[PDB]
């Protein structure tokens, strides 16, 4: 048993990174536009391309179209890839994100990549990154005083905020979480272990606060990101 075991990241390709980027919504959902989201999209495109990913973006897809595209990707072979990345930039609440016209439960999307459904990603990291609100709590500031594999294995779910909370987006620079994620990818993505790097992102995002707001009650409010690992090995993105 090797405590230092790393995923094999020596396939011919790093893999695909999908970015679903949602700026506007069907009028009847009564959801506000998400200015700054195309900055996140572009930022991520640069950072993941630099790590060797083949980045593919889709803008304001309807739910049916979104589902079709993710199904397609889950069905093409990833045999010669190291991993798979899928990013959602949108509104959300509870356990769902919004496509242009309707909510989608996040588990609907991830289930398509479980090992029985996507054999060519078995044993490979399947990384989902979600910039979206997750409920209606606004976090307050405080100060200190044969070995087979499970079909559910090797996912990493990277959320911009902990369960139940609002997440924040600057109208020009992009979301707090994506800005800080991209800064850390830029500096450390090609060297640090990926969950180590996500932890740094947690610290960066937790230092930010709502500095100004039309609602004075929301001034100084906060956000902590949250990642869930079902990974079984250390994950690095050393230059290929």
């Amino acid at each position: 048993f090797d405590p230092a075991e790393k995923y094999k990241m020596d396939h011919r390709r790093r893999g695909i990174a999908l970015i679903f980027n949602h700026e506007r919504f069907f009028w009847h959902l009564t959801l506000p536009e998400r200015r700054g989201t195309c900055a996140d999209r572009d930022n991520l495109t640069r950072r993941f391309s630099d790590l060797g990913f083949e980045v593919k973006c889709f803008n304001d897809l309807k739910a049916e179209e979104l589902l079709l595209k993710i199904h397609e990707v889950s069905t093409v072979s990833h045999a010669d890839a190291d991993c798979f990345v899928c990013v959602f930039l949108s509104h959300g609440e509870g356990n769902h994100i919004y496509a242009y016209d309707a909510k989608i439960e996040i588990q609907t999307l991830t289930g398509l990549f479980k090992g029985d459904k996507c054999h060519s990603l078995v044993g490979k990291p399947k990384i989902f990154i979600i910039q979206a609100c997750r409920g209606n709590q606004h976090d307050v500031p405080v100060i200190p005083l044969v070995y087979t594999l499970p079909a559910g294995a090797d996912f990493l779910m990277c959320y911009s905020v902990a369960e139940g909370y609002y997440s924040h987006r600057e109208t020009v620079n992009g979301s707090w979480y994506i800005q800080d994620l991209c800064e850390m990818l830029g500096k450390y993505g090609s060297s640090l272990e990926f969950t180590e790097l996500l932890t740094l992102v947690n610290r960066k995002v937790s230092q930010r606060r709502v500095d100004f707001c039309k609602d004075p009650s929301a001034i100084g409010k906060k956000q902590v990101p949250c990642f869930a690992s079902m990974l079984t090995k250390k994950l690095h993105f050393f230059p290929k």
Partner: peptide, 4 residues
């Protein structure tokens, strides 16, 4: 800053 806006809420997502």
């Amino acid at each position: 800053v806006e809420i997502d």
